[PDB]
Amino acid sequence: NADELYKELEDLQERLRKLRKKLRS
Amino acid sequence: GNADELYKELEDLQERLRKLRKKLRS
Amino acid sequence: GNADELYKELEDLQERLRKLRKKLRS
Amino acid sequence: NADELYKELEDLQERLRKLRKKLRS
Numbered sequence A, D: 001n002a003d004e005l006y007k008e009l010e011d012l013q014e015r016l017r018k019l020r021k022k023l024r025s
Numbered sequence B, C: 001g002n003a004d005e006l007y008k009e010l011e012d013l014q015e016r017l018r019k020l021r022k023k024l025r026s
Helices: A002-024 B002-025 C002-025 D002-024
Strands: none
Touching: A002 B002, A002 C002, B002 D002, C002 D002
């Protein structure tokens, strides 16, 4: 469903932001 | 620099997911 | 080890996308 | 659309596999 898919995409996007923050650290 | 190049590639993937979310709403 | 830990995290994200593709077909 | 979204997800999955191959190299 569009909402389940949307939530998963946002969680993956947040994980990438967090990995990028770790690369910076 | 490998870390800088990986950081940029991950930013591109992050931005692709941001845009997919926008397309799902559109 | 940072590179090994990054490799595993990227594998998890890759697997999440593989499973999302399966859900789209289901 | 489900097919456009699917194609994008697979391209992101392939990019992650390619980044992992580079981490190994």
